[PDB]
């Protein structure tokens, strides 16, 4: 589970990037971790 604000986005690139734009979060790591 995540804190609210993040969408679970996945690209054909084979990698997932967790986006939360309050403060523009673009990250490889799950933000709950």
């Amino acid at each position: 589970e995540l804190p609210e604000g993040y969408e679970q986005r996945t690209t054909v690139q084979g990698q997932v990037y967790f986006l939360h734009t309050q403060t523009g979060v673009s990250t490889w790591h799950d933000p709950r971790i």
Partner: peptide, 10 residues
């Protein structure tokens, strides 16, 4: 399904 950033190769 709404992103502003480009995807990283790192």
């Amino acid at each position: 399904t709404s992103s502003d950033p480009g995807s990283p190769f790192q």
